[PDB]
């Protein structure tokens, strides 16, 4: 805890790294995420379900 | 066949019977005026749109959900 | 009327003492649970009239003429509506 | 060079001259002389018949 | 000295975000003003980016506005925003204004905040009735013919106004390409008397709920309201985002996705529902003439609040007999509101008529008795 | 007003696209393209939707090729300056039916057939109207109902009189997916269809909003921590007066 | 009541870890957690709303063209 | 409107007996009903101060009222901020509820008219 | 130093905004001259091309320009009156200098009536400059050129800026 604070929280340009990083790392993931989640709860309706008939 | 055709026509002779009497009741009606003569030369002359949509209203709040549910 | 820090404009203070913790020293969320219900009920509870009594008139106004609006507009309605004209 | 049009058949090396800084293209289109320092650009463009190509 | 306050420019910014001192008890209904600063900084944003691609000319805006929804990238996020923004802004102007009324911040010594406060209320007006007729459907047209046709009723020069305005003999290219330059130029102006009614505010500051000083007790804007802002930001954009993304067109009106048409007449002719309480004050007025001036009358006198309302006491939380007044009030406009759409017909005519003097007798009659009596309770029922 | 002058109300029908996490069924969208080209573009034109829209909606590239290489196209004139035509490509915008108002109206009885690309955003009702009108023809019109000429009722339309007759029957078009085309099934497919058509970017917002309501709600719960957070020296302040 | 040194009562709100890194570190947490959800979701934004400005889809169908050759002499 | 005006006014009402029998009780309920007690105001501190006339008035306050209405003030900033209402000996008990103000602001009106009369006189 | 390079700011958005203003007509130098202009970004390393199809909205100078360059030509005089303004307020700290360049603290005049008064002269013989172009040689300044419709297949004879750039 001490730790974890010293090395990303104690200066901020460290923790603003931390934070955009996490962005980045976030931004990605959530993206992949929904993707799955959306295809799945909209499985069968959507152009790339029906797409393999033609 | 279409589906609505019999779950319209089961709505109407079901939940919708009063209404339906209502609309048929209007018809008899306003055909018997149109029959008389000097129907023409007339005032007012009265429709069955209104009994119409009560009975179309009621009719359709019983099947949307069941006709979309079988196509 | 409003000056700035340090001479703001308040009549002089003299006699007050004030506290308080910091922020990291405090449970943000202390309290929350009987403030959620029990402030928020009294809060609600000494207002309310002054919301239900204007919004219920207006209500009652407003469903007397859209309903007598749609009776006029039928035939049943026609001679009502004719002298209304 | 900037970004005109060489008048074609013109030029020293007969191909293109651009009129507006003097920059000669060859017949392939090559820069030779004057102040531009690349070859004329080549689209993507495939023959899909021996008549027509799309670009 | 912190280079915040030493350098001019940076202490004017300052001044206003920073260091600004604040009362410590402002409630929610505070948080308005930099919800309308969020619409109006959307609406710049959205509608210059509108502007790179919508074509002004009569033959082709509304063939560019489906450019827009169709071709251009988040073209129709943009289109939308853009649009439900202007509906958003005008529930922020309500609450903004409704808090005025009901915490007195139109008294002393906030008279000069207030009234240039109605002149931006006019200008917002102004700008979206302007925005609405650049989209050029059926709605844009016929709203734009039966709006500028009021003006014919200013006497003598009222026809020779109207063909001016339209550039033209009726609602056309002209009109919609003067409309689309004055609706680009109105809110950089409505941005400069939001700034000057905030230069008035700062003699005094921000009233408070109490309605007393706060020059006792006094918060820096930041960070406390600043991080208060942010709450309703968030909620701002969770009902920004219900409507952009789940539900686009719930505020607009059908007829304004069929292309102009100077023939066809539509059903009903209805303004946006922001100007509908106006609308119906117009429809009260038998006469032409007589409904323009009660119309605008309407907002006018809104500057008289500061001489009708008589108490010695600022604001409405310790006042239980102006708090239902308001409450009527309020209702009362909301009637007007809907009294604005339905169809000229009986019951509604009369209703219109009733609602219409409520309104007015609020500011001539009943404020000015209702606050004169609380005073002389104040005092009796004290002593 | 009478309820005739509105129109019957239409009900709210179960659409797969509604519902805030529902795509349009694209089964259903290919269908209702087959439908309108079959049946409605004999009299409606549907300007705004050029062939590349339907590729990856309802069709393939080469599909949809293939629908603008059968039609012509006006070209820029040759040499001499002659007109040409040209056959088509996914650039182009599906032609309508008539030249122009005048000639659409000659074909239907005075009637103008609107164009139908933004018919579901440009009515009260959406897919619910088209659904509803297509399907509520009644055999007969409600008895003292005089309908003028050219017209055929249909109580969902206002007024009751419409100019445009009852098209859809029992297998009018054959699909290509075996489904049995029923007038019901074919008013659905065809109403999903011009849904699309009037707001093409339907799925890609309803999915862009739900990261959208994902990531403000959590900012708008995290505002509320750090507001309270930052506040908490303001509302836990005390005071101890004692009168000079 | 009088004494300005009794301090008043602030136990219900006082926290026992007020001194640890464990305690400012949550709260640095919370205040990360937000400014990365303000990163991502300005970054979302801004991606989305500029790209208003690259071609739009009209553009780049206009684009691809097809020439005959039979037509051009030699020379 | 002016203090001196609500005070006159209430006179004339408090002089009739009819209308003190109906008036008073009234008066009476509304103030209790008003709620300005319950965050420990008293009446006067209500009063909007934003005025020459009123800044004259509560610069002449004795030095000990005014450092105590100083302190209700700020007590009751802190109430309405933590959407608390005041307890015990904060509620201002209705003998509390003294005018303490009313004078001070009466003869600075008195004052402030006389001279607005004075400005107006008439040789005759 | 504030108020200076401020100035130098509003200098450069003037020159953005004359230069839109210009392609705004659309003859041949408007169009030539924007596609010239605009692509001495292409010579950023690594992005310059990209950047420079982002500013056109496609693959050459044409109505997704133009029509962009329309509304921020019409936005870049509002930014700059704002940063115009600013420069003055950074200013009114020190005041004006004056030709001596030693300090005017020690004998200062109001601004008006003197130089009010002192500025109309000037204002009128810009006026009558300003008549002498408007009513009587108002094509001087200009390039026939963009009188001829912008042609993306001729390149003119001779792109060349207006003068002042
Ligand atoms: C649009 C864009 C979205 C952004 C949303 C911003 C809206 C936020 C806002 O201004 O209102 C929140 C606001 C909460 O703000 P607050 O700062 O806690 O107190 C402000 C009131 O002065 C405090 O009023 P109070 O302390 O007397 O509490 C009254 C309130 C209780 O308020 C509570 O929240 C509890 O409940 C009611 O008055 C309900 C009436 C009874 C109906 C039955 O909600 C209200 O109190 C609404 C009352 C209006 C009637
Ligand atoms: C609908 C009718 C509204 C009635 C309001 C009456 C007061 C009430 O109960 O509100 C709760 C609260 C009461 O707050 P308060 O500040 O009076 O009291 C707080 C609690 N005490 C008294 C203990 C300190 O009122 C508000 O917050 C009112 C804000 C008004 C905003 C109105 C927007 C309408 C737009 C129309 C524009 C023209
Ligand atoms: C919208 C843009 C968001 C950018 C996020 C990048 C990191 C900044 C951030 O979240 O705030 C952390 C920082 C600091 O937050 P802080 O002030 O709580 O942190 C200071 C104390 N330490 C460093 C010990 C944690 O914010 C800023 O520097 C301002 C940027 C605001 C965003
Ligand atoms: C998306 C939009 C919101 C995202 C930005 C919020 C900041 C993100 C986290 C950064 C943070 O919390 O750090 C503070 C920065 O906040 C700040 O400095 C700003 C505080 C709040 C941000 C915006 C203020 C809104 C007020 C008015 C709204 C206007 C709407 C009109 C467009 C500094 O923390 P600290 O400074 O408290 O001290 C602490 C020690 N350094
Ligand atoms: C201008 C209008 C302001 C309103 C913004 C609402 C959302 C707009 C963005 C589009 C969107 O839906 O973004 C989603 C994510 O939501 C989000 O994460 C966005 C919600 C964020 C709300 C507040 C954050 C900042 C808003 C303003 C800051 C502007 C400063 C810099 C532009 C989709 O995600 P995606 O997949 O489309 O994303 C691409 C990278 N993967
Ligand atoms: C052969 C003629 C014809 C065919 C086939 C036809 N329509 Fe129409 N349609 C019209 C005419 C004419 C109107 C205008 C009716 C009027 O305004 O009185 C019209 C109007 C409409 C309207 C608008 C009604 C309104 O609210 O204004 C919709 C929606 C519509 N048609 C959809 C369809 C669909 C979907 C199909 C077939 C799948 C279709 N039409 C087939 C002639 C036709
Ligand atoms: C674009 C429109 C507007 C913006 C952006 C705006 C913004 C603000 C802001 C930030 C404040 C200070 C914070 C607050 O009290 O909410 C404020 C205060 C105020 N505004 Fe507005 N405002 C706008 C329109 C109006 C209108 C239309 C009126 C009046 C009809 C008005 C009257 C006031 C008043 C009187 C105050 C002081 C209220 C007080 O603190 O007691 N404003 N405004
Ligand atoms: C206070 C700020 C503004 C308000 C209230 C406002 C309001 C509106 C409204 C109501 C519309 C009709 C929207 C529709 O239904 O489609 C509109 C359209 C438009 N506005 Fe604005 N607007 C504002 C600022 C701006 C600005 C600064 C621009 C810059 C040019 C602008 C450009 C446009 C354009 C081009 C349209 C037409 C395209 C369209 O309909 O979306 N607006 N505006
Ligand atoms: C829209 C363009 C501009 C306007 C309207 C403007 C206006 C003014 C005015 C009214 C003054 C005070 C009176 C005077 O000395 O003439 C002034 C002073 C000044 N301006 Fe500008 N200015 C503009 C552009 C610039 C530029 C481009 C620069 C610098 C590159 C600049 C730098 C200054 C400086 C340093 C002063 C103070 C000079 C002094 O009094 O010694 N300005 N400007
Ligand atoms: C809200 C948007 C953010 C941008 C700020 C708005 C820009 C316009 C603000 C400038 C208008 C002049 O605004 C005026 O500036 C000066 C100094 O800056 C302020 O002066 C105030 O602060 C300074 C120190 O901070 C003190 O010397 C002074 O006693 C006090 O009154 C005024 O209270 C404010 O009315
Ligand atoms: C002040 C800012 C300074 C510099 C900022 C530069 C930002 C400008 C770059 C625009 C980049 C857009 O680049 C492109 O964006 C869109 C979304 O917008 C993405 O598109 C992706 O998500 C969108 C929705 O968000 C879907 O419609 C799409 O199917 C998917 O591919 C592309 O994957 C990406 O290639
Ligand atoms: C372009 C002109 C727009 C003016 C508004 C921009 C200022 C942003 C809002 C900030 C704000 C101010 C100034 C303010 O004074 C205030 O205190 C009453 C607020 O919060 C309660 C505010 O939120
Ligand atoms: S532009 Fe081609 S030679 Fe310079």
Redesign the interface.
Known sequence: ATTFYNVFVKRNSAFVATILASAFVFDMTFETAIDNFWDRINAGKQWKDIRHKY | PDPAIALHEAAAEGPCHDFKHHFDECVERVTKAQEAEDYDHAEYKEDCVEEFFHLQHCINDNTADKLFRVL | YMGWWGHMGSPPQKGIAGYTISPFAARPFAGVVHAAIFNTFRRTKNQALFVILPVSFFYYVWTQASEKNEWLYTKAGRHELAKAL | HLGCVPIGEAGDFGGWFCPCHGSHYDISGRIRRGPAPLNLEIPEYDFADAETLVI | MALRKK???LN?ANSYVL?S?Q???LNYFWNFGSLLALCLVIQL?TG??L?????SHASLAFDSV??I??????????RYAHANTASFFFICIYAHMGRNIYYGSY???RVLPWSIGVIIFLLLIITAFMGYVLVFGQMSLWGATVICNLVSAIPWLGEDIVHFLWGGFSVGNPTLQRFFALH?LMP?VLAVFALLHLIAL????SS????????????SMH??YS??D??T???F??MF??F???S??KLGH??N??PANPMVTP?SIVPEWYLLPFYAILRAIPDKLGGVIAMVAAILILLILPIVD?????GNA????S??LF??F???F??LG?LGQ??I????IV?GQICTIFYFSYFLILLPMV??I?????????? | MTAAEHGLHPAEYPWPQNGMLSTFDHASLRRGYQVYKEVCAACHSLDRIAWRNLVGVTHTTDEAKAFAEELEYDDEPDDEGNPRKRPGKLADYIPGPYPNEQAARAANQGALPPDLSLIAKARHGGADYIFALLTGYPDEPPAGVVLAPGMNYNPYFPGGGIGMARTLFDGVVEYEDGTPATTSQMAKDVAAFLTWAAEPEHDERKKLGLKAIIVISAMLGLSVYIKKFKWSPIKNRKFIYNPP | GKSTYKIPDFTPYLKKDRNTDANRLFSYFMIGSFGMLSAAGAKATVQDFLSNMSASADVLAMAKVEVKLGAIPLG | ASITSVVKTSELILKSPLLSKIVVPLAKTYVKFSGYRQLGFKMNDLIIEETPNMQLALRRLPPTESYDRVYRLIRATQFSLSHKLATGNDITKPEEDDHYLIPYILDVEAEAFEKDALDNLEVV
């Open positions: 350098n001019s420019l004017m260091d001192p009362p410590s008890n944003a210059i980016t502007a790179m691609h919508y074509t489906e450019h929804m169709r071709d251009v990238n988040f073209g129709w996020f943009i008294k002393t010594p680009y950089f700062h003699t005094a500051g408070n709920p109490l309605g007393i000083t706060s020059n006792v007790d006094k918060l960070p406390y991080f208060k942010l709450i930001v968030f909620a954009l969770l985002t219900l952009v993304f789940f686009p067109d059908p007829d996705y069929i059903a008589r108490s010695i006491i600022r310790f006042k239980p007999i708090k239902l409450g009527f309020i209702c009362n909301l009637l809907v339905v169809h017909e009986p019951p509604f209703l606050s004169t609380e005073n002389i309770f104040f005092y009796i029922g004290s002593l």
